[PDB]
Amino acid sequence: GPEHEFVSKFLTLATLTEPKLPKSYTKPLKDVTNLGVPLPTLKYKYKQ
Amino acid sequence: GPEHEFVSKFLTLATLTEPKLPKSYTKPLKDVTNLGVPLPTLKYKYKQ
Amino acid sequence: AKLAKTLQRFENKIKAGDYYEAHQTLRTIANRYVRSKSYEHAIELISQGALSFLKAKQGGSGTDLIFYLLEVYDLAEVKVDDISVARLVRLIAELDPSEPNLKDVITGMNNWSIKFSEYKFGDPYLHNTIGSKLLEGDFVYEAERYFMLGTHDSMIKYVDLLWDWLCQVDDIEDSTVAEFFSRLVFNYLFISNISFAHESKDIFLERFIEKFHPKYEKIDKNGYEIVFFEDYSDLNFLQLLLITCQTKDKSYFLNLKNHYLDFSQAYKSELEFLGQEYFNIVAPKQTNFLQDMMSGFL
Amino acid sequence: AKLAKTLQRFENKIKAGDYYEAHQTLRTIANRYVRSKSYEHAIELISQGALSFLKAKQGGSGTDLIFYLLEVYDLAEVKVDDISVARLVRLIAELDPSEPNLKDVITGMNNWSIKFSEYKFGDPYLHNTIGSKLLEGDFVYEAERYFMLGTHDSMIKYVDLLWDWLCQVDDIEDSTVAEFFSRLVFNYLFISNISFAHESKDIFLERFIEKFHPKYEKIDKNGYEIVFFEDYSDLNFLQLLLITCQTKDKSYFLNLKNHYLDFSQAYKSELEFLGQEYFNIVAPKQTNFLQDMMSGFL
Amino acid sequence: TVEPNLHSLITSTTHKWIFVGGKGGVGKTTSSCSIAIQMALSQPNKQFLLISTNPAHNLSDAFGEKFGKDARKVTGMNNLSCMEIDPSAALKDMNDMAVSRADLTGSIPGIDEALSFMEVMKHIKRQEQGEGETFDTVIFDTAPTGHTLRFLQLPNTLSKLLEKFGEITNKLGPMLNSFMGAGNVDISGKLNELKANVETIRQQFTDPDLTTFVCVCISEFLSLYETERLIQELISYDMDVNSIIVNQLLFAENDQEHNCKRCQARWKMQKKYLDQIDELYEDFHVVKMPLCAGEIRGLNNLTKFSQFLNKEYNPITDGKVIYELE
Amino acid sequence: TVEPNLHSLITSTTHKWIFVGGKGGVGKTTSSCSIAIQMALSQPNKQFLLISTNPAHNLSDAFGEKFGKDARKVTGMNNLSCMEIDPSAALKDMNDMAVSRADLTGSIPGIDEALSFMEVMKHIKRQEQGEGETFDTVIFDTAPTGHTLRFLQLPNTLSKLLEKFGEITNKLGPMLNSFMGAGNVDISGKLNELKANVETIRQQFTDPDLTTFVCVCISEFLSLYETERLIQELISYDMDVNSIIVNQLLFAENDQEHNCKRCQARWKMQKKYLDQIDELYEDFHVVKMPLCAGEIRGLNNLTKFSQFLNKEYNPITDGKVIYELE
Ligand SMILES: Nc1ncnc2c1ncn2[C@@H]1O[C@H](COP(=O)(O)OP(=O)(O)OP(=O)(O)O)[C@@H](O)[C@H]1O
Ligand SMILES: Nc1ncnc2c1ncn2[C@@H]1O[C@H](COP(=O)(O)OP(=O)(O)OP(=O)(O)O)[C@@H](O)[C@H]1O
Ligand SMILES: [Mg+2]
Ligand SMILES: [Mg+2]
Ligand SMILES: [Zn+2]
């Protein structure tokens, strides 16, 4: 549907120019200060 | 001085009629509730 | 359970000389007695043991057993009677003036007397011995508050103590006698024991007239006699205050207060309490800090 | 003081079989070593003893000696290096998954790594082993936060764990895969490790395409390739969010947010944190309760 | 009747808490380990826990195996776990480390009693819930007389303080509502829940068929009278104490060659104080335990020494145990 | 060098506080009484006090004479007073009784440590003032390892809490001034006075020439390693501990007829742990004390047993003391 056209247009606009941050950017762990909000727990349970 | 006359007049006025409370009144200790303010300590000291 | 051998061991230890083992055995027997809800046997056993240990000049064991006896008194609901009070009076008699915890045991006996009697401060017969024992231990200020609510002999001993305290002071400076007589008048006027106040005043003034040599004049009218001094106006003020409190009238109190302005200022608390107690003068209520802040700021 | 016979007794006890007496003797020798300001000898002695006790399947003694080693690490100011980290890595390797205080020792090692290194959360090489050991002990939620700040092998193990977790769930309900992939994208976007995020996304999507059979279309332009699904729009939203965060522009973020309104509402915290971190969006400050009361009432 | 053994306590199917206390080194740890081992041997269907509430724990030394703040099964015993209450100080992440889900008060004196009470609360909560590890009985290796007395008296103090706090909260209800913000936390509900939990703890701690106290002692003046004072204090708290373990007895008369002048004068003193103990506590389970040829350490040695809790120690016949125990 | 006796401590003219601690019945009370008696015998010009900080006091049982919350001279000893800290509960008048001049907190666990610290504060205040009874040295008969450790660690906790309270008061100065009324009480001044007193207490408690710790123990695994842990904790607090009293030693080799299987196997174990102790603490004053033919109670018996603190016990020659002591 229209979502395919939206995705294609969004990708073309985003990749029109090379992004400011490289594709393989890796900020060193020494400079990381905040890990962000905690993710919600899943409604399953790993049991191997 | 005048204090003698004042004392005599005060005694005569006080003893004009028999006081409401008898001379030998003794309120029973069972009904005593308050002992009043504490007296000030003396500047001296018992030795004995 | 009979505690035959335990009692035999207690007697053997107390006779031999080992008093601490005897004290511990006695505590054990009393624990078994109190546990079995036998309070009479425990009471006599503890009282006799405490008396025996106090006679042996051992403050610690005897005092601990007095505390145990008071605990049994509280737990057994013993009323204040002649026998029950005499049981503590004997222990007070055998107590030592130099007891490190004499005040503690005295307070315990007084608290028991308060709790199990109609008196709000203690049995007067108990107070008579308590005050004398505290005086022997140099607790004069604490021993004066016990002679206050004692018997007639307590009043006699209070007057004797005040007279001795006055005589022990070398100087006079026309302020000693007033300060001694003020206590005798005010303490016996607070509890409204005006008969005792009058008798103590008579005894103290007679002793003052005997030992010292002031200028006294017997102003006697209607049956009431007051001694008058020229230099010692404080004694006259105190006698007239006693008479005014006796007659219970506002006008006489106002005249005495606004005449002796300096002495009324000096004894402001005593006169305002006397007015509140006798003349139905509504004294200002206690100025609570939190209430004062709430009213003045909030 | 030489501790010759004490060390001989420790060796004899550890060889004979009495491991607790050997542990106590080792603690004594280490106390004497640390007291004499000889931290190297104490460090090797404690580490070797802890390894020996962990090899003997004794969690208590080995874990207590690991705690002692960490205390000596803190007190001796040992920096995070290859040898020092490997010393703890060996103990983690010999640790048991069923250790009752496995989390405690893991937290202690991580705290030491935090305190004595430039990393704000721990040495990645240490985290790689810590996460695997915690996963062995069924601490999956706690073991995911350690693979996050680990090495490349940590990312590989994180992807494997997420894939196994997804495979272990029988049902799908077109919500499982999205919920699993969201963690992989968001965790590696928070620390801005976008290279790891891209590689993990590639691995996860390849595994999804292999095991499952959805409708995928490779929309590749300029060098950037995104797989497109019809029913699974959440994967497309996550890939486009990764691309938008990569390009770091406000307009693309706004278009994605107001297009995928439902998913933006579902992940509101994640999108607002991503906007604050990347697009310099000033998120509202913490609503402190006391400050809220003061502003709204006072 | 009162037989001189703990057989009634060991085979009892109703007891939930069993405190072992006494006076400073009379054998509290050894006798608590012995009671726990005998109970777990005689009741293989129930799981028993052995907590060490002494702030300087000695369960590990007695059992020859390190125990921690968490329950750990005793090696060789499949229904007996041992725990030594660590003084909190739980390790916490230095930084955030948001996993998907002060210290000064830890140094305040009396913290260990509070921690022991918190452990008791956790265990009663677990028993009510029946989740995780379930321990049907808990044996306490308590501290010496004064501190175990403070521990046992703590529930009453906590209940009184909770009642006072609830009364103050009820008095200040309108005032706290007008002062505090829009908080929806039910202070009264949580306070009542805590009061109910403490009341359940007290009800279990004053039930003769649910809890008991075993007073270990040695036959000496200081120990005997310390035990007497401790028993009096327990009776004051209304806690069922009816067992006494007279420990470290020489038995130098009916033995082989106990003719050592000292090991005989000490036995004369011990027999005198044994007669005193038997005169005092005629209704108690007075269990006489021997002094062995060495320390009682290790599971096998503790079991061999504990075998005398079930059956009274007969020095005439059971005289080789104290020498096979070195 | 380190001679095996407490002669350096007994004749020391500088020590002010002397704590005696250990593990639960190794002889803390007996050895503290012995140290106090020896000090008061060797220094007749100084008045010594002996406080019992154990909440279940045993000074009276050891001395055969009842002592209370207040200092009482020991009968037969003119320069030695003994005090047992009662847990407050001071008797107060039920009603006003205006002489011319709560309880729940008394039941809170850890109250006895606070009371002991208050007694220490009172004694240091008296020494500074030099009024009333003046005690030049105070010997503490402490509780077992954990609780005496809590007592000794209490000054640090109190200092930290006082610092935190002062910091909070300084932060809230304007706020407390705007909130509270017209009170003229100098909170900062009293807080600083309390901080200075606590700092003086800490300075005296960490001075090797003013305070010391004597660790009594018996040669056994539990006691030896409990003593090791206690010494480590004391060193952590920076308190000078350099004396150890190994108590209740059989000495069954160099005696007359100590040939009883048990009284010899026990000595074998005791000698093994004595060798371990001598290996561990090579720089300590390790005083070896014998096991007598009875309890050590009474002033004469305590003096006879204490005579071995001044001079090392020689079992070859001083073998008749343990039999003249029953
Ligand atoms: N019946 C006995 N025969 C021989 N040794 C014994 C006996 N009972 C205990 N012991 C030993 O005596 C020492 C002290 O006993 P234990 O450790 O049980 O004391 P405790 O009551 O726990 O002391 P604390 O109050 O310090 O906790 C230990 O080494 C123990 O093994
Ligand atoms: N060297 C000794 N020889 C014989 N008996 C001793 C010796 N030392 C102590 N005792 C006795 O052993 C018993 C226990 O000792 P003590 O009362 O000194 O213990 P403690 O360390 O004060 O214990 P607690 O930790 O309970 O306070 C007492 O009856 C004491 O008289
Ligand atoms: Mg113990
Ligand atoms: Mg003691
Ligand atoms: Zn022997």
Author numbering:
A (entry chain C), B (entry chain F): 7 to 54
C (entry chain E), D (entry chain B): 11 to 308
E (entry chain D), F (entry chain A): 4 to 104, 127 to 351
What's in the article?
The Guided Entry of Tail-Anchored Proteins (GET) pathway ensures accurate targeting of Tail-Anchored proteins (TAs)—a diverse class of membrane proteins—to the endoplasmic reticulum (ER) membrane. In yeast, newly synthesized TAs are captured by Sgt2 and transferred to Get3 for delivery to the ER, where they undergo subsequent membrane insertion. Efficient and protected handoff of hydrophobic TAs from Sgt2 to Get3 is facilitated by the Get4/5 complex, which is thought to act as a scaffold to position TA-bound Sgt2 and Get3 in proximity while trapping Get3 in an ATP-bound conformation necessary for TA binding. For Get3 to receive the TA, it must adopt a closed, nucleotide-bound conformation, which forms a hydrophobic chamber capable of accommodating the TA's transmembrane domain.
